[PDB]
Amino acid sequence: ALHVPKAPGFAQMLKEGAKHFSGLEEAVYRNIQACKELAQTTRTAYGPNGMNKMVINHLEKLFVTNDAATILRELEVQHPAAKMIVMASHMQEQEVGDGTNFVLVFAGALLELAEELLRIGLSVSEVIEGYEIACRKAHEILPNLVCCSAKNLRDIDEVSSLLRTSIMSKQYGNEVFLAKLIAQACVSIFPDSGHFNVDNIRVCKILGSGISSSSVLHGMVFKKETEGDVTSVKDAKIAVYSCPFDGMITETKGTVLIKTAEELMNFSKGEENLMDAQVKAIADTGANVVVTGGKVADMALHYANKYNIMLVRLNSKWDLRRLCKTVGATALPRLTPPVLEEMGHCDSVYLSEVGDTQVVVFKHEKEDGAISTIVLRGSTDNLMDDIERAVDDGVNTFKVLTRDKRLVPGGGATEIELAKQITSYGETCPGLEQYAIKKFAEAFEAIPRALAENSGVKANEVISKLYAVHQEGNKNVGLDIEAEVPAVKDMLEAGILDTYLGKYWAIKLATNAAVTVLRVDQIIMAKPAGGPKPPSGK
């Protein structure tokens, strides 16, 4: 009588290293606890006062950031429910580009409050009913909280003021400079058509001169050198080839079949004469710059130097495509001279040395083009990666504004108003759903609570002040970061605004994630694999 045996049935038939959790205690509460640990792991990075984290991944690579999605990717989250919340956060990053930390905070809060409600005696089904109905009310409410709209995305001062909020949470100290840069870049792009592509904003990270040395470039920069003797061109007539800069060869197999001393004597001279003819036809179309996606031959380079053509070699195909979009050219699969339409043009193409790095710059003078580059200077690669993430946030905000121009107040104002209105809705709903509705409402309080906690003030004082001021009627009031004591101010008049779409999708995804985590009742983990990882994800 000194060992409890496994019970007959599933407990015995289960494999060796497999685990089975069932019920509120073994499954639901453990999942909620894991998600709570996750939310706690990422809470201290929320907001402008959010602190950076130094995550080292399994490859000993270092990420210094307060970007929630980046931290989550580089963490090795192993609990499945936390994995699900992270999946939701990554869907937020994909759909909107900003708001991943909101998704985490809100999901963790909803799950904590759901645990509370299950302890007081509600069923997961009723909790889910209340959470879903309250999410529907939140979506019904949010459109009415919209205060501002963009009204112009071709301007640079309005666009800078609009991107400032998204690029403030990240890179708080310097947010006017970066917002100016990202506005310049975004408005050079964004044509007369309503479509805006974020991949057309390129970021080149060069090292050594502080972030204030960053710049925008209407064109392209390649950390390459020139293949030939020419390094500068002032009226670029670029010709782009996806083929190498060499004589075309057979796809099957080629053999030089010599049968006479004359053929042997003439073969090499014929090859060079052919190359000379090819490159001279290219030069005679007026092209002064040739950009090949493949290799360069020594003879072809010789003759390009002879005819004063700048040769550039882009190993990547995406780089070639983006250069074609930049210059207005067409990648030719043959070494045939380009027609007047297949040619691209640039007000300048030159080789420069930005810092230690040598670069080839295709620079337009016009304040437009199909692609724009942000040259980020900085004393550290990690610092520049963080600033690139801030740039990505600003650009994704610009795209969200191209999609939906509506704006809600930030700094917790929207969250407090949502909490208030959903509490007022739950107070009217009778039945067991009111508890869950009121908890869904109170969950919004987690956002200004995190902002206050990170600013370095008492979250309770802040939340009480916000509730009091929002009772008086002010829906645009949120907390003040610029105050050693708990304080509040008009988010609108201050210009601290978020995107209607950002909040919409964050609430939707966080609610779906929490509700999904709750619907789990049994977990049957398998023994961990030594498999060479998922085959499709490579």
Binding site: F10, M13, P80, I249, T252, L274, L509
Partner: protein, 525 residues
């Protein structure tokens, strides 16, 4: 024992012990799967050894994902896999009825009764139950409303209620489109494409096709309005000769001539396509879309783009038929004698980029005999769950159409068949009547577990329901919101006659074969 004297490393379970093993394993499976049954069931999460997550309520998926190494469990998993392969639904109920037959047989075998007599009673009860099933089956003209109720009964068990109300219309409309009068429904003609960007309630039915790839030439259009679709299976890339030809030249000029010539073979097929395009749309009003099951090299892509053709390459071997049935052309393996009659029409063709991948929509076809279900969702596991649910629902509607009969649900047929078996028992000669009783108490596991899952007392609910069915005769089942009896045919709770028949047959057969097992033996070393 006998085997262990010859093969010392042999494992053996004899007579009663063997029975003990098998029934125990069955009951173990039942304990796991009992919660899967019905819309009030709970979703289980299953984590692979790699860490992949599955959220499922499906009996077959749950079986194959549980971590089990039992021979009886293997037998029952295979029976469920056959149930799923042929009918698409009925796996959880299959496992439950198997487990309950074994339990109810243990009830009498523990009393020293021989399993042979229980199996005779099983056979008698199977016959009478199949008869009562064919009698109570509802032969109904399969209208959109009936099919909607059927698909609801399946999707509400497999997914959330709002998402089930969406997938219902999606699935019923999908089948009612690919359906030809008195000609078995080929579910292959319903492509199933999943996109991972939007909410799960955005899952839709595209009355056309969605290819998981697009054009690889950038200068190719991203949207085509009035499109001629050329479905081909012809290589448009460089093909080397079978006989290892090899090129021999004496001069750079000859090398250039051979390089220009070696592509003439494929340039000619591209020229054929381009001439067809010019002859069928002499202006830029219409569009022209080539969809090739084989490759297209960059040179051909350039040649076709220059003429304004949108070329997608390496499509799926099934998309050939799906496109010829949706658009309405002819799929070609050669351009020898191609005519405008070989072309299909699509009132819209466009491209959608999602992260790093591209999709191509072909919509506004005239009367497509092939459609697609676009499974949208925010998570891989949401997409997998919706795929499983739509598989179940498609099979359900297909079976209700094929078998023009339909059976009431909510355990109603099970209750009524139990009563009929209990009234039939005296007509059985010998102690096989006890096996009949066991069969009845086995049939009664469906309503019981439904009550168990809705949060009600099994015994009270079952007596209420049987009382209501004896006083009225109305085929009644469980109301999962009140625990009271309800007329399933009146409230729209429908099950598939094929599924119930397959349950009876397969469950009886496997349970009989297990009960007659008297020795489990591993002696192969």
């Amino acid at each position: 024992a006998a085997v262990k004297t010859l093969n010392p490393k042999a494992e053996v379970a004899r007579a009663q012990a063997a029975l003990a093993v098998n029934i125990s394993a069955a009951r173990g499976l039942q304990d796991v799967l009992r919660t899967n049954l019905g819309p009030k069931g709970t979703m289980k999460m299953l984590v692979s050894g790699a860490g992949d997550i599955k959220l499922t309520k499906d009996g077959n998926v749950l079986l194959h994902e549980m971590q089990i190494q039992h021979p009886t469990a293997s037998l029952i998993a295979k029976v469920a896999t056959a149930q799923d392969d042929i009918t698409g639904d009925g796996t959880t109920s299959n496992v439950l009825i198997i487990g309950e037959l074994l339990k109810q047989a243990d009830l009498y075998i523990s009393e020293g009764l021989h399993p042979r007599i229980i199996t005779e009673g099983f056979e008698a009860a199977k016959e009478k139950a199949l008869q009562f099933l064919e009698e109570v089956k509802v032969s109904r003209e399969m209208d959109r409303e009936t099919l909607i109720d059927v698909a609801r009964t399946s999707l509400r068990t497999k997914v959330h209620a709002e998402l089930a109300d969406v997938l219902t219309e999606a699935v019923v409309d999908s089948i009612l489109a690919i359906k030809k009068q008195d000609e078995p429904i080929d579910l292959f003609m319903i492509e199933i494409m999943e996109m991972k960007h939007k909410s799960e309630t955005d899952t839709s039915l595209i009355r056309g096709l969605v290819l998981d790839h697009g054009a690889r030439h950038p200068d190719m259009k991203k949207r085509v309005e009035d499109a001629y679709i050329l479905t081909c299976n012809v290589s448009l890339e460089y093909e080397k000769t079978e006989v290892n030809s090899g090129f021999f030249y004496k001069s750079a000029e000859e090398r250039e001539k051979l390089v220009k010539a070696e592509r003439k073979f494929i340039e000619d097929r591209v020229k054929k396509i381009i001439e067809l395009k010019r002859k069928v749309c002499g202006d830029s009003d219409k569009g022209f879309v080539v969809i090739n099951q084989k490759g297209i090299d960059p040179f051909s892509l350039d040649a076709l783009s220059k003429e304004g053709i949108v070329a997608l390459r390496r499509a799926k071997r099934r998309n050939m038929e799906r496109l010829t049935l949706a658009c309405g052309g002819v799929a070609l393996n050669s351009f020898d004698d191609l005519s405008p009659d070989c072309l299909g029409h699509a009132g819209l063709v466009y491209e959608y980029t999602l992260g790093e991948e591209k999709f191509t929509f072909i919509e506004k076809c005239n009367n497509p005999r092939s459609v697609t279900l676009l499974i949208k969702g925010p998570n891989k596991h949401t997409l997998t769950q919706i795929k499983d649910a739509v598989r179940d629902g498609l099979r359900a509607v297909k079976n209700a159409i094929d078998d023009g009969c339909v059976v009431p649900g909510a355990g109603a047929v099970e209750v009524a068949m139990a009563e009929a078996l209990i009234k039939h028992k005296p007509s059985v000669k010998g102690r096989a009547q006890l096996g009949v009783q066991a069969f009845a108490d086995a049939l009664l596991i469906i309503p019981k577990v439904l009550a168990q899952n809705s949060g009600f007392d099994l015994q009270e609910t079952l007596v209420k329901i049987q009382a209501e069915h004896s006083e009225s005769g109305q085929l009644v089942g469980v109301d999962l919101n009140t625990g009271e009896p309800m007329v399933a045919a009146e409230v729209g709770v429908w099950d598939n006659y094929c599924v119930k028949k397959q349950l009876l047959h397969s469950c009886t057969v496997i349970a009989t074969n297990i009960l007659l097992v008297d020795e489990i033996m591993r002696a192969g070393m």
